[PDB]
Coordinates of C-alpha atoms and ligand atoms in Angstrom, one line a residue:
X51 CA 73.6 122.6 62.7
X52 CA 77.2 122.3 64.7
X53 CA 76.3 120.5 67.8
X54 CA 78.6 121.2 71.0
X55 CA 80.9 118.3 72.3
X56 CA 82.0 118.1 75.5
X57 CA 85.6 118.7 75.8
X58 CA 87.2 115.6 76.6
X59 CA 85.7 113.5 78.9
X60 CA 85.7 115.3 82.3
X61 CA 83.5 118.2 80.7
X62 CA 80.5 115.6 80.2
X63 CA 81.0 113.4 83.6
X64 CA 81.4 117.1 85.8
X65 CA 77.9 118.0 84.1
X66 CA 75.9 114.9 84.4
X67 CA 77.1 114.6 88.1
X68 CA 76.0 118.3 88.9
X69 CA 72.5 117.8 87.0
X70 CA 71.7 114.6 89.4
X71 CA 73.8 115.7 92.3
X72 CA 72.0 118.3 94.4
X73 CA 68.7 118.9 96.7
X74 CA 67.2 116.2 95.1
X75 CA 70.1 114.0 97.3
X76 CA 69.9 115.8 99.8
X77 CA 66.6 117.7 100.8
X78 CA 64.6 115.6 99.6
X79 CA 65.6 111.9 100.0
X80 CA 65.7 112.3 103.7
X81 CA 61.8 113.7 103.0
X82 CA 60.5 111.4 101.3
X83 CA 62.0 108.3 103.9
X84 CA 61.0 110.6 107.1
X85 CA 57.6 110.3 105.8
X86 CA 57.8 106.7 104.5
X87 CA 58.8 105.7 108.0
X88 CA 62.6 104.1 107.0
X89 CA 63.2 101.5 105.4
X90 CA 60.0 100.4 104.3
X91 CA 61.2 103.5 101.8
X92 CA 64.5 101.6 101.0
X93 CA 63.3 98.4 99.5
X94 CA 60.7 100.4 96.8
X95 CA 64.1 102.8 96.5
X96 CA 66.8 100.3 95.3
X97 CA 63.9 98.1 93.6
X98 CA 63.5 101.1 91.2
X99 CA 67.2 101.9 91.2
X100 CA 68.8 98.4 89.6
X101 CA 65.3 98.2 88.0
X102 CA 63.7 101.2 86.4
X103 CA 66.2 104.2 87.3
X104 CA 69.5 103.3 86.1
X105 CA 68.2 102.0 83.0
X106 CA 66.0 104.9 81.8
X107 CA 69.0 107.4 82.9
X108 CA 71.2 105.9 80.7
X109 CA 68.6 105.2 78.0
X110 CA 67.9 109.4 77.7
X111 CA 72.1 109.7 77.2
X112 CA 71.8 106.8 74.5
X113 CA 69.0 108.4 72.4
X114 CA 70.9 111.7 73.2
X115 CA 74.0 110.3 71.6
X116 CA 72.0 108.2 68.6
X117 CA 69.9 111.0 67.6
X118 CA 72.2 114.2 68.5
X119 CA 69.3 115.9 69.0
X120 CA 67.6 118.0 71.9
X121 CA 64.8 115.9 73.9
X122 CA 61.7 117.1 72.3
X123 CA 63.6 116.6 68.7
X124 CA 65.0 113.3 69.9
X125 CA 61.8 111.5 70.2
X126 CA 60.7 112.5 66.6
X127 CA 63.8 110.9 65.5
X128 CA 63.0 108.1 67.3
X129 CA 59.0 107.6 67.0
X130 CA 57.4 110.0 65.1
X131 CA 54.0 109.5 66.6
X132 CA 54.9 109.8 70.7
X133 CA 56.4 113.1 70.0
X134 CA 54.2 113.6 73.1
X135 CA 57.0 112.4 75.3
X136 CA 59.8 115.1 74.6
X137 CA 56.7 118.4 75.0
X138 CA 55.5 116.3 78.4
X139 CA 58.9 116.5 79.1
X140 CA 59.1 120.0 78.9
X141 CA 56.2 121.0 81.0
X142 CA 57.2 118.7 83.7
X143 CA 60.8 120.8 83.8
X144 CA 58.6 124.2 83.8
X145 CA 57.2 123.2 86.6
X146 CA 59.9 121.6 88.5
X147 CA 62.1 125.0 87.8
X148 CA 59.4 127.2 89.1
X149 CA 59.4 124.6 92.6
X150 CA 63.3 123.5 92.5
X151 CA 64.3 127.4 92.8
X152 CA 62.1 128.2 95.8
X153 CA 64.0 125.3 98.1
X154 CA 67.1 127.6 96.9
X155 CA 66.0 130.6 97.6
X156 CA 64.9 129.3 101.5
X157 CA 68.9 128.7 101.9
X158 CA 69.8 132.0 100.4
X159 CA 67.2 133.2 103.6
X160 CA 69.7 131.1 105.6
X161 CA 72.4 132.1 104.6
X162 CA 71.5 136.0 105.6
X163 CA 70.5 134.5 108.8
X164 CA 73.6 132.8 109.5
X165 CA 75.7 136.1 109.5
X166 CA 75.5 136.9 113.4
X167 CA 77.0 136.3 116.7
X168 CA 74.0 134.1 117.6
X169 CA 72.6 131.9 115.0
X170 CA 68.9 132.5 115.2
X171 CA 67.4 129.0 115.5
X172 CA 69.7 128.2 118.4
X173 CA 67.2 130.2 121.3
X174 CA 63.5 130.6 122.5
X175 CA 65.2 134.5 123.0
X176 CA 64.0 135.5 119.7
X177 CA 60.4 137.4 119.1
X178 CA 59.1 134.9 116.2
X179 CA 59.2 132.0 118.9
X180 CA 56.3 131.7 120.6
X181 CA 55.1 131.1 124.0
X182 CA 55.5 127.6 123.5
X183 CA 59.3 127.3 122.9
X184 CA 61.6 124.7 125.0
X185 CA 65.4 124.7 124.2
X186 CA 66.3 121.1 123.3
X187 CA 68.6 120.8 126.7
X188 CA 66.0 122.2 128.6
X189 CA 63.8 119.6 127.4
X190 CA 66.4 116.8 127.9
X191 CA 66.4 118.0 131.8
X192 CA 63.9 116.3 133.9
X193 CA 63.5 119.0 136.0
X194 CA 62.4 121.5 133.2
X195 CA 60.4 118.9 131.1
X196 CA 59.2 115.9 132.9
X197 CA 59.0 117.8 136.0
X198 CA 56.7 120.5 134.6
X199 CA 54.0 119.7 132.0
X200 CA 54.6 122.0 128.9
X201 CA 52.0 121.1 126.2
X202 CA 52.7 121.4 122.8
X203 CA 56.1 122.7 123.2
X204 CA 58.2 123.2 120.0
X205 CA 62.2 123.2 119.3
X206 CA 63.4 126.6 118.7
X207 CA 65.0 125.4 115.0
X208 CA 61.5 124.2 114.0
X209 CA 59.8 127.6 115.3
X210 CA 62.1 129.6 113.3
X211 CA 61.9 127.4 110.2
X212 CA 57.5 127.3 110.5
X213 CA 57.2 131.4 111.8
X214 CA 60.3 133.3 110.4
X215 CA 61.3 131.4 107.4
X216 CA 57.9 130.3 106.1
X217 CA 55.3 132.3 108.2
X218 CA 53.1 129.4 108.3
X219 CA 49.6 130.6 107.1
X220 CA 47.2 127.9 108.6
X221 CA 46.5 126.9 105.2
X222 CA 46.6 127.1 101.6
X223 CA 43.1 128.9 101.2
X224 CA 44.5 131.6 102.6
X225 CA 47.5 133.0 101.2
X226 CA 48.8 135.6 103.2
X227 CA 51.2 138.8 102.2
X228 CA 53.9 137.9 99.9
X229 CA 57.3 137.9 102.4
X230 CA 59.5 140.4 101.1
X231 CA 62.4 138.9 102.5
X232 CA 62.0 136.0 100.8
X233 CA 60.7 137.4 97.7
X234 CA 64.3 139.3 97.4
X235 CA 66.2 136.0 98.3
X236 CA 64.3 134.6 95.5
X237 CA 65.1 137.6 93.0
X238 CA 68.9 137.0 93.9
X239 CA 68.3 133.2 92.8
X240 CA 66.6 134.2 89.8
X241 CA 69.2 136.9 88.7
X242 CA 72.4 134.1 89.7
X243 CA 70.7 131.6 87.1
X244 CA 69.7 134.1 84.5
X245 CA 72.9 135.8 84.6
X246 CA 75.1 132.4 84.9
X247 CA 73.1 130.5 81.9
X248 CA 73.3 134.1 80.0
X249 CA 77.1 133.7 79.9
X250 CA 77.0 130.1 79.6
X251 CA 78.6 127.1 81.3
X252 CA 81.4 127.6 79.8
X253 CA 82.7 130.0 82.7
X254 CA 81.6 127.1 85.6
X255 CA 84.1 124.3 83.9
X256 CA 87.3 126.3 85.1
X257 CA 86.1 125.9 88.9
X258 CA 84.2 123.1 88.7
X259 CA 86.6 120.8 90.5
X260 CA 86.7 122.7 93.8
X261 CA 83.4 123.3 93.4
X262 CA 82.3 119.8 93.0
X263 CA 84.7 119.0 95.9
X264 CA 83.2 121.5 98.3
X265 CA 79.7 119.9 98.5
X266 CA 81.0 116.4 98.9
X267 CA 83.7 117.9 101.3
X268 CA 80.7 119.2 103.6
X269 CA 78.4 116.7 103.4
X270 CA 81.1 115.0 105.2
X271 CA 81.9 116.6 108.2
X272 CA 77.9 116.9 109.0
X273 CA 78.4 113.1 108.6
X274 CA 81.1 112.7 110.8
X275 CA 79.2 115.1 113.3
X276 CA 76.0 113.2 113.4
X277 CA 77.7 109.8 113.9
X278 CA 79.8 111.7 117.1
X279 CA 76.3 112.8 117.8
X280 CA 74.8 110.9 121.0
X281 CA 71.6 109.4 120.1
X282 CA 72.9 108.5 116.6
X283 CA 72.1 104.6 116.7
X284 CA 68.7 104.6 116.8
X285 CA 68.4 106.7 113.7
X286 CA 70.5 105.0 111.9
X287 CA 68.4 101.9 113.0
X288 CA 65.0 103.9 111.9
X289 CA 66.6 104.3 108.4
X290 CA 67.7 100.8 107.7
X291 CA 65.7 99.0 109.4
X292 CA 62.8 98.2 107.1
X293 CA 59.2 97.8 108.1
X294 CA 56.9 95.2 106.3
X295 CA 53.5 96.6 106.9
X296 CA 53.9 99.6 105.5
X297 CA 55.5 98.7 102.2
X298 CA 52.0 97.1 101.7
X299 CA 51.0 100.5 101.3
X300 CA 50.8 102.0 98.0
X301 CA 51.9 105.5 98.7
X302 CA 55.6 104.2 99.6
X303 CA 56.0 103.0 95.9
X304 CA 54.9 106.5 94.7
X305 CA 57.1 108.4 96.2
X306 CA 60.0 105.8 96.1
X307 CA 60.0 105.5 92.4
X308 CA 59.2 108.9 92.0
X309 CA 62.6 109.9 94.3
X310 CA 64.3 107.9 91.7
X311 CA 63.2 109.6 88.3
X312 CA 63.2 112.6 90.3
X313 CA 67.0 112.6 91.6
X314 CA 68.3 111.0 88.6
X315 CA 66.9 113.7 86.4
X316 CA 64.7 111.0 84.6
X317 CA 62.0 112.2 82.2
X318 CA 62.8 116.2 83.1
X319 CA 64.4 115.7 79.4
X320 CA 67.5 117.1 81.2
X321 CA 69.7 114.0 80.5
X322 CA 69.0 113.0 77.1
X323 CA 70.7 116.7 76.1
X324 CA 73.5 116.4 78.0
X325 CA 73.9 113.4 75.9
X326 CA 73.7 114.5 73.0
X327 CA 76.4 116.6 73.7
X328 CA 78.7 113.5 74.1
X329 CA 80.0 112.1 71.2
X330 CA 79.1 109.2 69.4
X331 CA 82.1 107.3 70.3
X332 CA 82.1 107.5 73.7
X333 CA 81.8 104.3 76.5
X334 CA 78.9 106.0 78.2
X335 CA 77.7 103.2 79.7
X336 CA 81.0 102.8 81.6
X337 CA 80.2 106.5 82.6
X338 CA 76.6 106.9 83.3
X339 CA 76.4 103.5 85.3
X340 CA 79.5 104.9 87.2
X341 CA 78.0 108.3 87.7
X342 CA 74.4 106.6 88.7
X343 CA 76.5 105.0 92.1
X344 CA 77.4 108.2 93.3
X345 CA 74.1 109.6 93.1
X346 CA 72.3 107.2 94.9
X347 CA 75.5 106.7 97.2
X348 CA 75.7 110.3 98.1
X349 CA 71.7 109.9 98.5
X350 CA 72.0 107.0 100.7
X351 CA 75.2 108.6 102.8
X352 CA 73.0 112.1 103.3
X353 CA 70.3 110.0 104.8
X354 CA 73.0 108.8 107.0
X355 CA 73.9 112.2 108.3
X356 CA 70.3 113.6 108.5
X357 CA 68.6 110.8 110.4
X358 CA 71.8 110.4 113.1
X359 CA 71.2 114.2 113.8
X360 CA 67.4 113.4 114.2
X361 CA 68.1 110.2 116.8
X362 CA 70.4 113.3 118.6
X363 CA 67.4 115.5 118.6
X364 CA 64.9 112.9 119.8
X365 CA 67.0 111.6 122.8
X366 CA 67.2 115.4 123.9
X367 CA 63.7 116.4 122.8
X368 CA 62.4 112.7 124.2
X369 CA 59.9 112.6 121.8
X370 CA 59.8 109.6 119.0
X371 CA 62.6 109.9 116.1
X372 CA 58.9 109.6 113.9
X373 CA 57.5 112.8 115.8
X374 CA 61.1 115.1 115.5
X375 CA 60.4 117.0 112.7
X376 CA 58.4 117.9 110.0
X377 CA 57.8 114.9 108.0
X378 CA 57.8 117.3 104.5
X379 CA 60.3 119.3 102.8
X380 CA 61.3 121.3 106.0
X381 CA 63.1 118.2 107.2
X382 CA 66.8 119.4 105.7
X383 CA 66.3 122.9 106.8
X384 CA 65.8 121.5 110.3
X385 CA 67.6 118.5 111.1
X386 CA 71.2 119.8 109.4
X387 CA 70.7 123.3 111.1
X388 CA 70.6 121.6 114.1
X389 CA 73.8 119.8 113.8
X390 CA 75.4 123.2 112.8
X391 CA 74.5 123.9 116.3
X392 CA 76.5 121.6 117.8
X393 CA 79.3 122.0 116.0
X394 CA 82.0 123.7 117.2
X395 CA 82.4 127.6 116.1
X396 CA 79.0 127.2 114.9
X397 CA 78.6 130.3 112.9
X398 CA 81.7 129.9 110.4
X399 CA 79.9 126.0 109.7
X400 CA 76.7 127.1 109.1
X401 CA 77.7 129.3 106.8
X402 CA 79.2 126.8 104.7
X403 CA 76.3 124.2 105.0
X404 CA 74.3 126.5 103.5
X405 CA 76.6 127.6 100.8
X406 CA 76.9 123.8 99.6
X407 CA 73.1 123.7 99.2
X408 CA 73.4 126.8 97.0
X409 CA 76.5 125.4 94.8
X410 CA 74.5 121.7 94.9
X411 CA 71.1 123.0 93.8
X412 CA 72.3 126.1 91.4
X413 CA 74.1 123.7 89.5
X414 CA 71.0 121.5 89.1
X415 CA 69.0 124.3 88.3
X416 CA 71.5 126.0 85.7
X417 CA 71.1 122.5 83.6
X418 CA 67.6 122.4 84.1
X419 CA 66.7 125.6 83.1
X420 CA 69.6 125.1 80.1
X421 CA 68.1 121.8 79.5
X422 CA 64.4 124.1 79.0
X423 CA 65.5 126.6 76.9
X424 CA 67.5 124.7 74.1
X425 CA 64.9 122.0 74.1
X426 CA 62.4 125.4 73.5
X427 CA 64.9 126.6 70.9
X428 CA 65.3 123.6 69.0
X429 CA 61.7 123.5 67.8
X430 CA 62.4 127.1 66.0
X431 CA 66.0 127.5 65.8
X432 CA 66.0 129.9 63.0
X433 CA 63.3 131.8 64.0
X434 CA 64.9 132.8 67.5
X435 CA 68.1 133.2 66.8
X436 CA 68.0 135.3 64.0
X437 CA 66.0 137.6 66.4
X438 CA 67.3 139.4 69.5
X439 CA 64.2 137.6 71.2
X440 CA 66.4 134.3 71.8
X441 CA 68.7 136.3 73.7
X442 CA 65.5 137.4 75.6
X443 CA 63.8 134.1 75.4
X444 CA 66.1 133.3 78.8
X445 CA 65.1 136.1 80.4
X446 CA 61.0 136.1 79.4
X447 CA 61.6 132.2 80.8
X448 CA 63.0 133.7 84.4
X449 CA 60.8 136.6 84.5
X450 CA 57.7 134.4 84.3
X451 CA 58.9 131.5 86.4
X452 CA 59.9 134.1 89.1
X453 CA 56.8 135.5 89.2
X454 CA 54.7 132.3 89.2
X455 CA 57.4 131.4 92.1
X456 CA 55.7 134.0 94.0
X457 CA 52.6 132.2 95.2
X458 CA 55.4 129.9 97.4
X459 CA 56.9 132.8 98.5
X460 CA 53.7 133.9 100.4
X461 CA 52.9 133.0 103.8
X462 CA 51.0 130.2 102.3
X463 CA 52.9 129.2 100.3
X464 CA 55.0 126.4 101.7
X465 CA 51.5 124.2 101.0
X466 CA 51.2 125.6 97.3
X467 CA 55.0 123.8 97.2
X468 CA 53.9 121.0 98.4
X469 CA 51.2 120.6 95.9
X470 CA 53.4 121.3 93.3
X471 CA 56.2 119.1 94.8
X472 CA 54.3 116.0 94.9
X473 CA 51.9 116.5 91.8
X474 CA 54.4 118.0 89.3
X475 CA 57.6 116.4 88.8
X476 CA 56.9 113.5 91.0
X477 CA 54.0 111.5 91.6
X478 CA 52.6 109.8 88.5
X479 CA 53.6 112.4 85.8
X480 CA 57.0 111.2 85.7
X481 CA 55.6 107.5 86.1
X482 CA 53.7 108.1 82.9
X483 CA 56.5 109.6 80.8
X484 CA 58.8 106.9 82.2
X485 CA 56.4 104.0 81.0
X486 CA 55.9 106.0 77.5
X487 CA 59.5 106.1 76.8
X488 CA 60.4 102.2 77.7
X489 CA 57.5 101.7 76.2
X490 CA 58.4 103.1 72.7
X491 CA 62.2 102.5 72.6
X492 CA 61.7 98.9 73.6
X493 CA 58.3 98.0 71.7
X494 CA 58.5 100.4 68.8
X495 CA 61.9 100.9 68.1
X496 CA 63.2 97.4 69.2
X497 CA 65.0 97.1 72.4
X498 CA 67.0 94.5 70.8
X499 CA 67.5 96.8 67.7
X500 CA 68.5 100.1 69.9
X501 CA 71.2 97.1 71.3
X502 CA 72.6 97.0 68.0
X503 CA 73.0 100.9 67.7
X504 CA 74.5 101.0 71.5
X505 CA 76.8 98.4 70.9
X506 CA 78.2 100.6 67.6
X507 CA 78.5 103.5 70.1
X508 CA 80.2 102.0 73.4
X509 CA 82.1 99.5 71.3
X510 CA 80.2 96.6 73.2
X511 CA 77.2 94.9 73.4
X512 CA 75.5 95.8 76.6
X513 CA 74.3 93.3 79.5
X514 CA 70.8 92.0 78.9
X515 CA 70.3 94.0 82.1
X516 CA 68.7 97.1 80.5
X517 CA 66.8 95.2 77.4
X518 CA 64.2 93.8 79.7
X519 CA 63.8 96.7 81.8
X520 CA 63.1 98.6 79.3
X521 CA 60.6 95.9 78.0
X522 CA 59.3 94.6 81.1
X523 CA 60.2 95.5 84.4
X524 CA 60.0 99.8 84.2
X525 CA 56.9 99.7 82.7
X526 CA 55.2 96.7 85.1
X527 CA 56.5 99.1 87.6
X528 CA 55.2 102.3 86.6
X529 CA 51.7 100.8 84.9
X530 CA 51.3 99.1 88.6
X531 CA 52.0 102.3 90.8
X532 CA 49.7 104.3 89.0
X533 CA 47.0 101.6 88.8
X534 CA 47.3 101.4 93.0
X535 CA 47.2 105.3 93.2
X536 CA 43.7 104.8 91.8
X537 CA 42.5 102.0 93.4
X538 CA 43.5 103.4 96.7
X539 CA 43.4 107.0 96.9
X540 CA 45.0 109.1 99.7
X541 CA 44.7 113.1 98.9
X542 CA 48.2 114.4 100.4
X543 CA 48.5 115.9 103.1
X544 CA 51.0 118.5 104.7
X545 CA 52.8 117.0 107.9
X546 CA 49.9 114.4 108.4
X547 CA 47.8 117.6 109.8
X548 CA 46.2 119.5 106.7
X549 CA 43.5 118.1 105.0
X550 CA 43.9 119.6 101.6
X551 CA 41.1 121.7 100.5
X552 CA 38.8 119.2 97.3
X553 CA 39.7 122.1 94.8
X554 CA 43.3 122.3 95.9
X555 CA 43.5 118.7 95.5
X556 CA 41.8 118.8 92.2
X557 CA 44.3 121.9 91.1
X558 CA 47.0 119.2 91.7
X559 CA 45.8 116.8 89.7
X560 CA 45.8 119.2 86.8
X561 CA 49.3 120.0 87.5
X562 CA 49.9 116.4 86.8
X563 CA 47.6 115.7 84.2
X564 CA 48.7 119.0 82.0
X565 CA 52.1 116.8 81.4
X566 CA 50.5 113.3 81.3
X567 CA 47.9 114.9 78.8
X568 CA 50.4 116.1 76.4
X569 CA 51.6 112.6 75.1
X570 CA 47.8 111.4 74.3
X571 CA 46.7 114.9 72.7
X572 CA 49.6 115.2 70.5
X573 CA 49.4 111.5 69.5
X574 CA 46.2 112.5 68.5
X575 CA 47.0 115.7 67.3
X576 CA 49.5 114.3 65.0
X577 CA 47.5 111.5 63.6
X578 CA 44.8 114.4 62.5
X579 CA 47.1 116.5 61.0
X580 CA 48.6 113.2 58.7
X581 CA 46.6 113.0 55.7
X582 CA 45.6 108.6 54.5
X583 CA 43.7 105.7 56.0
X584 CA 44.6 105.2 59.7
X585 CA 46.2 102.6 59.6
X586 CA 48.4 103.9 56.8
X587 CA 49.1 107.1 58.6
X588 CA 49.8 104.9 61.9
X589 CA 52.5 102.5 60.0
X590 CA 54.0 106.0 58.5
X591 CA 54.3 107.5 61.9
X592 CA 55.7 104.7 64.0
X593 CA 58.5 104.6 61.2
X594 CA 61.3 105.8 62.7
X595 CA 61.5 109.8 60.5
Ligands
CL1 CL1 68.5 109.6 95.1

């Protein structure tokens, strides 16, 4: 039927910027390096980005704009057959909802927190810190630290982030009461995104450009501060400086590439909607490759900010910038508090840090979960919207996803997050649905021939740049990072201190393989259900529908 086009120009670029622009940037980039020890993250980061990510982010907005057609009913447009891709798509954006909400819903807990005289991860005072607390100055004094042994002594901002926030449980066997507190916070996130995508974006657009701003606005002055910071040198050093022996590794190239199908929305299905959106004639490729700068530049800058305040904290702590903090997702909701801090009239800036996360990841989330529920309409438009049941369909979505949210929200549920972090939505289920989609619009459809269509649309024949990553370099990457994930094996681990439990492990894995399943079984599926000789039925399916 009558497909929605973005009004103008600014309607589109405003959306596509808030889908890749948000806690993927900025929680967990900085994660991902902190564990990656620096730059030896870097050179497997840009190597995907001017290889594998910018390509495939603008190839979803070109088959968005070719086919005009939601992800899943893209790919059937496109190649019959690997329908697989556009349903793997959608249980990888399930997944990464249920996940991708609870990081909000820790700020929301932040936020509350940050409404008093004393912000609460600034003392050892407080009754959640245990006996082993040492205020940051204190420890920077000789005379309290080095002077007097104090084992095991932790800052007061981590303490509150591992025993208030989360409750650490001491592991994921054992799950613990589901925190109220956080359970409500998480409600309050559910009900903003359900009531927001219930009314549509329409309402956002009005706003959007303070709203935009405000993030970008913030994220500066916590850069400014860090750089002011004392200490700030040598994390900046730990971050570029790149070390050789670890980018032997394999698990660096994991979770680099990952980062970058991750942050640029790649293979959630999210992007190629919100290009379908655009209209034909529109230069996208002036756009997207313009938009793709700032996401990996406000990426790159964030890390900036985070890793000056972590030299700050080691000079004062003493300990190793490596040692500092959690090396997981806790990282942003422990370095960037601290810098809050040590800012001046702390309270009114920590309010506002934690308000950007909210705007940065809510508007991520609203296209996300937008991006879910018209991909799950399109299959059965009639059918839904005929019913009242479409208009529930949003809220049967939420009401589920909130409830499977609740095994984070539990004391143990910071390493259910991490399971689900690092095996769904990252890890090699995006790196098989990244492969599967080069591999189809560049083998089976003809990377020169989609050329052809693209040059119709921008009014230009693209740079051989993206032809022969689509063809050669994204899927030697991908097809090589999985291939090492096997060879070498690491189970993950949380912090580099849990030992994942075999069947937790093994639980992961079928998070993963649930998405990376869906493109074999439906190839198969399909090829059963299409009646002639194989090879018949295979010719008539690769044919473009
Ligand atoms: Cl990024």
């Amino acid at each position: 039927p009558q497909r929605e086009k973005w009004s103008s120009k600014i309607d589109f670029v405003l959306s596509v910027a808030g889908g890749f622009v948000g806690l993927g940037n900025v929680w967990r980039f900085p994660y991902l390096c902190y564990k990656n020890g620096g730059g030896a993250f870097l050179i497997p980061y840009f190597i995907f980005l001017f290889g594998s990510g910018l390509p495939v982010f603008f190839l979803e907005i070109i088959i968005g704009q070719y086919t005009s057609e939601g992800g899943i009913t893209c790919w059937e447009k496109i190649c019959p057959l690997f329908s697989g891709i556009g349903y793997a798509s959608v249980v990888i954006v399930s997944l990464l909802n249920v996940y991708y909400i609870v990081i909000l819903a820790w700020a929301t807990y932040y936020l509350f927190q940050s409404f008093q005289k004393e912000l609460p991860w600034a003392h050892c005072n407080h009754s959640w810190n245990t006996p082993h607390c040492m205020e940051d100055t204190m420890r920077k004094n000789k005379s309290v630290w080095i002077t007097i042994s104090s084992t095991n002594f932790t800052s007061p901002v981590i303490e509150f982030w591992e025993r208030n926030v989360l409750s650490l449980s001491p592991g994921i066997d054992h799950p613990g009461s589901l925190k109220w507190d956080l359970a409500l916070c998480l409600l309050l996130v559910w009900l903003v995104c359900f009531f927001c995508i219930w009314k549509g974006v329409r309402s956002t657009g009005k706003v959007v450009y303070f709203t935009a701003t405000f993030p970008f606005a913030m994220l500066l002055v916590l850069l400014v501060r860090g750089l002011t910071l004392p200490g700030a040198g040598a994390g900046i050093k730990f971050y570029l400086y790149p070390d050789i022996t670890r980018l032997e590794d394999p698990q660096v190239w994991i979770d680099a590439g990952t980062q970058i199908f991750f942050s640029y929305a790649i293979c959630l299905g999210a992007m190629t909607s919100l290009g379908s959106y655009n209209k034909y004639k529109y230069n996208s490729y002036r756009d997207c490759m313009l938009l793709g700068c700032l996401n990996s530049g406000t990426s790159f800058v964030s890390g900036f900010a985070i890793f000056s305040i972590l030299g700050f904290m080691a000079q004062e702590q003493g300990v190793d910038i490596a040692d500092v903090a959690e090396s997981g997702p806790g990282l942003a909701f422990i370095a960037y508090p601290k810098a809050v801090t040590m800012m001046p009239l702390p309270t009114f800036w920590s309010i506002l840090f934690f308000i950007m996360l909210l705007l940065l990841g809510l508007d991520s989330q609203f296209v996300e979960v937008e991006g879910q529920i018209t991909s799950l309409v399109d299959l059965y438009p009639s059918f839904l919207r005929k019913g009242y049941r479409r208009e529930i369909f949003i809220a049967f979505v939420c009401s589920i996803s909130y409830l499977l949210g609740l095994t984070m929200v539990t004391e143990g549920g910071m390493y259910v997050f991490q399971l689900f972090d690092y095996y769904a939505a990252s890890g090699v289920c995006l790196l098989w649905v990244a492969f599967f989609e080069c591999f189809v619009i560049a083998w089976i459809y003809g990377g020169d021939n989609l050329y052809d269509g693209i040059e119709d649309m921008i009014g230009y024949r693209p740079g051989p740049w993206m032809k022969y990553s689509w063809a050669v370099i994204t899927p030697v990457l991908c097809v090589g990072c999985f291939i090492f994930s096997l060879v070498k094996y690491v189970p993950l681990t949380y912090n580099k201190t849990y030992v994942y439990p075999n069947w937790a492990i093994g639980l992961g894995w079928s998070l993963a393989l649930s998405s990376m399943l869906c493109v074999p079984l439906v190839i198969v599926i399909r090829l059963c259900q299409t009646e002639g000789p194989f090879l018949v039925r295979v010719k008539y399916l690769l044919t473009p529908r």
